[PDB]
Design a binder for this molecule. Structure first.
Ligand SMILES: O=C(Cc1cccc(O)c1)Nc1cccc(Cl)c1
Length: 186
């Protein structure tokens, strides 16, 4: 099946807890995969304009590890719940992808999660301005704009709204698209 095939692909790239005990400032992100209309999608958030860091920008759910978290996957799930109302029973964490080093002292660990088909986002408006899906295949043929660094522009055909996706968020989206969609018969 589509989902069993995606999970099997993802597991081959799992680094697990290899880098998890290193003494960094630690954040986790959830790369949430949603199956709709017979295709896989990634779920993104638009950060509230009220936030200090990166107001109005597109990013994955997640946040800073806190002492309650059993592990880095727990960070991602706790923060996703706070931000978009995703409950742990609504997500199957499939793997941990390559962590992202930033600012010399920070390590961001991405987890890919399969999201229940009945999930409907309940965003905290203090943190999240918007939630939207992008088909995973978009990231194989994105609409690229140069700002010099590459920015993706995705227009939702449901409503004509264009979102800019860039940086780590764009990079991770492409990675997941490659992992899951490469070398597939039609
Ligand atoms: O903070 C994150 C995870 C995260 C961490 C580090 C970098 C990055 O792009 C995303 N995500 C989020 C998304 C919406 C609102 C709020 Cl309040 C936070």
């Amino acid at each position: 099946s589509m989902l069993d095939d995606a999970k099997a692909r993802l597991r081959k790239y799992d680094i697990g807890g290899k880098y998890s005990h290193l003494p960094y400032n630690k954040y986790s992100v959830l790369l949430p995969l949603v199956a709709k209309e017979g295709k896989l999608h990634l779920l993104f958030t638009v950060r509230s304009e009220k936030l200090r860091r990166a107001p109005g920008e597109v990013c994955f759910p997640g946040g800073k590890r806190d002492p309650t978290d059993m592990d880095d996957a727990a960070t991602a799930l706790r923060e996703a719940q706070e931000e978009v109302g995703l409950r742990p029973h609504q997500v199957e964490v499939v793997c941990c992808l390559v962590p992202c080093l930033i600012d010399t002292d920070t390590l961001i660990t991405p987890f890919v999660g399969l999201i229940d088909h009945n999930f409907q986002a309940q965003p905290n408006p203090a943190e999240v301005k918007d939630v939207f899906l992008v088909p995973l295949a978009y990231f194989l043929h994105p609409q690229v704009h140069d700002q010099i660094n590459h920015i993706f522009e995705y227009t939702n055909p449901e409503d004509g709204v264009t979102y800019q996706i860039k940086g780590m968020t764009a990079n991770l989206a492409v990675l997941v698209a490659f992992i899951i969609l490469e070398k597939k018969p039609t």
